[PDB]
Amino acid sequence: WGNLGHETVAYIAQSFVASSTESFCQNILGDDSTSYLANVATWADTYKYTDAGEFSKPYHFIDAQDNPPQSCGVDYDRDCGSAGCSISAIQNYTNILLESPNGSEALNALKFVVHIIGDIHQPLHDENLEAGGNGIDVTYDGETTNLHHIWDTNMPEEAAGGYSLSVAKTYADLLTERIKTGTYSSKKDSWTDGIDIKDPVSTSMIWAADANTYVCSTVLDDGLAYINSTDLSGEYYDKSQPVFEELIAKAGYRLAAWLDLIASQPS
Ligand SMILES: Nc1ccn([C@@H]2O[C@H](COP(=O)(O)O)[C@@H](O)[C@H]2O)c(=O)n1
Ligand SMILES: *[C@@H]1O[C@H](CO)[C@@H](O)[C@H](O)[C@H]1NC(C)=O
Ligand SMILES: *[C@@H]1O[C@H](CO)[C@@H](O)[C@H](O)[C@H]1NC(C)=O
Ligand SMILES: [Ca+2]
Ligand SMILES: [Ca+2]
Ligand SMILES: [Zn+2]
Ligand SMILES: [Zn+2]
Ligand SMILES: [Zn+2]
Secondary structure, rough: OOOOHHHHHHHHHHHHOOOOHHHHHHHHHHOOOOOOOHHHHHHHHHHOOOOHHHHHHHHHHOOOEEEEEEEEOOOHHHHHOOOOOOOHHHHHHHHHHHHHHOOHHHHHHHHHHHHHHHHHOHHHHHHOOOOEEEEEEEEOEEEEHHHHEEEEEEEEHHHHHHOOOHHHHHHHHHHHHHOOOOOOOOHHHHHOOOOOOOOOOHHHHHHHHHHHHHHHHOOOOHHHHHHHHOOOOOOOHHHHHHHHHHHHHHHHHHHHHHHHHHHHHOO
């Protein structure tokens, strides 16, 4: 996602973490504001453009070598690759926070986890075709862009009504309501099935596989004749909106559950 989606994921997670988890994170981040996770949720996307952070570019995605929309699937050993991926990064940075939470690496590990759990839930961050859809040029509200970009940025920002941190906070409030009492309230109790702090790869692969299903059902079902030739701000946006909203909600809810397990200690 772009910045709005990552900040939204982070604000949702803040609404679901335990108090002890909130304290654990605020202490690592040096931030006890009511934006502590949202304030770092975009860091990985600035870091990756620097010489020191170039190593981390591949950590934003897992390039699933499936065949959408006919067939979707993610395979860690097939798809991660030698340079690492979102799944290998979740393992590495989770284990830093479990083993060395008071050490110098915990700060960036936490900022990576906050960001990357968000990215796992962007379906085109779980898809090899055309580099996650970057190579698929599209028109969106009369503008030339690409299919990856409209999932990251154009569509979530249209739905949220803007791009800023305060717009993200409002959007997160909306999606948090849908989890607690609204749209998602009868589904969300299943959203952490399979979670296992002892197996970060298995856990994050369940999430990536979930998001990847929507590459076939939603991102590409209409087919590329339609997608290449049509302004995607109309009916394509209308069908995409419920899907990216639920995936942003899932990312925040799952990030909260994961941070709770990272911070957990038996009383
Ligand atoms: N194979 C790739 C290449 C890029 N990406 C994502 O596409 C976006 C644009 O990446 P590039 O700037 O590398 O073209 C980023 O969000 C990046 O994480 C991806 O999801 N799969
Ligand atoms: C784990 O993270 C550290 C710090 O960013 C990095 O140096 C290291 O290469 C990572 N290891 C793996 C296996 O991704
Ligand atoms: C859609 O555009 C992509 C990327 O340029 C291309 O690979 C694909 O063949 C196109 N499909 C159609 C039916 O136009
Ligand atoms: Ca909770
Ligand atoms: Ca690739
Ligand atoms: Zn992102
Ligand atoms: Zn992206
Ligand atoms: Zn990213």
